[PDB]
Structure 1
Amino acid sequence: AVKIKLTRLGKIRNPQYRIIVADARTRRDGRAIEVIGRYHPKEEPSLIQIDSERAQYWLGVGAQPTEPVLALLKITGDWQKFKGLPGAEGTLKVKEPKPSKLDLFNAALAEAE
């Protein structure tokens, strides 16, 4: 009964999670068969990342994701692709790019002069 897992990492005030494929009977931080993704709640955009091919292979062979894993798969589109109902839709929002400090400095120097 292989299931998709989330493992707590990081200090107390900023949790981080590893999207892991492992047996259900093991511990929360037990031995991991493979790592395929990650999840960072703290950042307000909630950066997401999953290995598409490996996730599709695991779903095909018959792993059962938990509720949050299923939510992530739906929002990323892997679940939609596997089921074939709507197709492959990307609802993920990308991290807002940090403007280049080089050009921040250039604008600041131009304003100064």
Structure 2
Amino acid sequence: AVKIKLTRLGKIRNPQYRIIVADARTRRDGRAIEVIGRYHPKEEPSLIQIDSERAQYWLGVGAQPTEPVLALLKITGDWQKFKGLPGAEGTLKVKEPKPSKLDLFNAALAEAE
């Protein structure tokens, strides 16, 4: 069966995962049919991106998600949408963008002067 898996990238103690469509038999770090997303658990909130157009196609043809990929598809709303259930908007959290560096430079200029 063709499945949607996490493949491990990154270095020791820094697991970064790509969301890939691959045959069940293929080894984890093996050739993938498509990369449809990425998942970085070490972040807060863990980084999640999914190409929803491709996720819908692959679930349509019958790709079977793995357990963690199924959790991610529910957060993104791609699972609920594919099935017809509600919640398609999803509950995806995004990291608050840190203050821009230029603005903090202006802040320091004003503060001291």
- The residue that corresponds to 1:78 in the other structure is 78
Q: Where in structure 1 do 4 or more consecutive aligned residues deviate above 2 Å? A: none
Q: CA deviation at 1:90?
A: 2.6
| Higher alpha-carbon deviation: 45-54 or 85-94 | 85-94
Q: CA deviation at 1:106?
A: 0.5
SS of structure 2 residue aligned to 1:53: helix
SS of structure 2 residue aligned to 1:49: strand
- State the TM-score, normalizing by the size of structure 1: 0.96
SS of structure 2 residue aligned to 1:81: helix
Work out the number of aligned pairs and report it. Answer: 113
- State the TM-score, normalizing by the size of structure 2: 0.96
Write out per-residue CA displacement over residues 75-112 of structure 1, whole angstroms, 9 at most, x where no aligned residue.
11000101112152230011211111111010111011
Q: CA RMSD in A?
A: 0.9
Cα distance in 2, alignment partners of residues 60 and 8 from structure 1: 25
Which residues of structure 2 form unaligned runs of 5+?
none
The answer on whether the counterparts of 2:74 and 2:90 sit within 8 Å (CA) in structure 1 is no
